[PDB]
Amino acid sequence: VYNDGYDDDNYDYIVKNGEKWMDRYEIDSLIGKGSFGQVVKAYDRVEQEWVAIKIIKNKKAFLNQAQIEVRLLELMNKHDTEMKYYIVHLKRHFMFRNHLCLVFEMLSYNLYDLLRNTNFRGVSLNLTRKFAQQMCTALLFLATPELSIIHCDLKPENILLCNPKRSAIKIVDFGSSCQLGQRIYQYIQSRFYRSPEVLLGMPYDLAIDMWSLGCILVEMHTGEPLFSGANEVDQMNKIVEVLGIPPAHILDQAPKARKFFEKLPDGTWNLKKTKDGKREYKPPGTRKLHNILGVETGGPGGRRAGESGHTVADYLKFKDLILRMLDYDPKTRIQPYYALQHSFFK
Ligand SMILES: O=C(O)c1ccc2c(c1)nc(Nc1cccc(Cl)c1)c1ccncc12
C-alpha cells in the first residue's frame, strides 16, 4: 500500500537486486542508507559504466530539498573549472516510480572508513596534506561568486575516495547545501563539525565549511574527533577547552550566547556555571592543539616519533593552518584561496 508496493513504511524504495530500470540501468545491490533515502550500485547499459544512484525518499519534504540539491549540482556543472574534480559529478537525474533518482559517478569508501582501517590511529601527515589541499580547492570552487555554495554538512563520511588505493577524494552529499543568503535552516552541521557561529545561532556564510574542514583534518591525522560533543552545550565547551572563550565581539551579537556564557559586569564573557558546580572540562584554552597533535613529541600519541614526513617543522606548519581554520571569527577565518598559499603545502 506504499507506492503501490514499491516503498517500505519509511518512504524508501525497496531495492531489488537485479532490477532493470528504463531499459538502461541494471541495479546490482544496495550500497547504504542515509537520511535522504538510499544509494545503490548500478550499471548503465548505455554508457557501459558503473554508477551510484541516489534514490530520494518518496516524501514531499525530502523531494523539495533534493530539488535544491540538484539545482546546486547542475549549477556546478555549468562551470567547467578543473576544481570540481574534487566535487562528485552528477551525471543525470530522473523520476522512477515516484522516486527522484540522482545518477552519480561510482566512487569508493569514505574517509571515516579509512580511519577505521587504521584502528583510528590516523593516517599520515603526508596523506592528510593531500586531503587538505584537494579539500581547499573544492572549497574554493564553491566560493566562486556565481556559485557561493555552502556545503553545510562537511564530515569524513561526506568525503569519498575515488579509488581505495590512491589519495584522490571528492565531496558528496550536497543535500543540506544552500547558496548564500538563501539560507533556510539554523540547525545545519553535524555536531562534531558544527561551527561556533551556528552553535551561537548567528548568521553564517561559506566559512562554516572551512571550520568543519579544520576539524576533519585533525581527526584524519589523530584518528579521533577534535570536538566530541554529546550535545550543543557539551560541544561548545569542548571547543572552549581548546580555543578558549569566544572573543567578546562575537558573543555580544550571538542570540544563543546565553546558552553557553554569561556576561560579567567587567564587560567580559565567561562560561555559565554548571548546576552541579562540578568540573567536567579543562579550563578554557588549556587543552592545547600543540599537545593534541604531538608537535614536539612525535605526533598524535607519539605514534609518528622517529619517522619520515612528520618533522617538528611539519607539525608547526600543520598546527598553524589548522588554528587558522578554527578561527572563531568567520570574517577572519582563513579562506580557501589563502589556505592554498599556506606554507603547510610548501
Ligand atoms: O550523496 C551524494 O552526493 C553521493 C554521491 C555519490 C556516492 C554517495 C553519495 N554515496 C555512496 N555511498 C554510500 C555509502 C553509505 C551510505 C550511503 Cl546512503 C551511500 C557512494 C558510493 C560509491 N560511489 C558514489 C557514492
Strand content: 15-25%
The total beta strand count reads: 12
CATH superfamily of the largest domain: Transferase(Phosphotransferase) domain 1
Number of helices: 10
Tally of individual domains: 2
Provide the helix percentage. 25-40%
Q: How do the strands line up in the largest sheet? A: 1-2-3-4-6-5
The CATH architecture name of the largest domain reads Orthogonal Bundle
Q: Largest sheet, if any?
A: 6 strands, antiparallel
Name of the top-level CATH class of the largest domain: Mainly Alpha
Mass-distribution shape: globular
CATH topology of the largest domain: Transferase(Phosphotransferase), domain 1
Radius of gyration: 22 Å
What is the SS-derived class?
Answer: alpha+beta
Say which molecules are bound, naming each kind only once: the ligand O=C(O)c1ccc2c(c1)nc(Nc1cccc(Cl)c1)c1ccncc12
SSE inventory with pairings:
Blueprint: E1 20-21, E2 25-33, E3 37-44, E4 49-56, H1 60-77, E5 90-96, E6 99-105, H2 111-117, H3 125-142, E7 149-150, E8 159-161, E9 169-171, E10 178-179, H4 196-199, H5 207-222, H6 232-243, H7 248-251, E11 261-263, E12 269-271, H8 289-293, H9 312-325, H10 336-340
Antiparallel strand pairs: 1-2, 2-3, 3-4, 4-6, 5-6, 7-10, 8-9, 11-12
The structure holds the ligand O=C(O)c1ccc2c(c1)nc(Nc1cccc(Cl)c1)c1ccncc12.
Write a structural description.
- The chain has 346 residues and is α+β, with helices and mostly antiparallel strands.
- The protein has 2 domains: 20-80 and 88-105, Phosphorylase Kinase, domain 1; 111-345, Orthogonal Bundle (Transferase(Phosphotransferase), domain 1), CATH 1.10.510.
- Strands 1-2-3-4-6-5 form a 6-stranded antiparallel β-sheet, with helices on one face.
- Strand 1 (20-21) and strand 2 (25-33) form a beta hairpin.
- It has helices at residues 60-77, 111-117, 125-142, 196-199, 207-222, 232-243, 248-251, 289-293, 312-325, 336-340; strands spanning 20-21, 25-33, 37-44, 49-56, 90-96, 99-105, 149-150, 159-161, 169-171, 178-179, 261-263, 269-271.
- Bound molecules: the ligand O=C(O)c1ccc2c(c1)nc(Nc1cccc(Cl)c1)c1ccncc12.
- The site of ligand 3NG has 15 residues, from strand 2, strand 3 and strand 4.
- The modification Phosphoserine is found at residue 176.
- The modification Phosphotyrosine is found at residues 6, 11, 25, 43, 85, 185, 187, 315.
- This is Dual specificity tyrosine-phosphorylation-regulated kinase 1A.
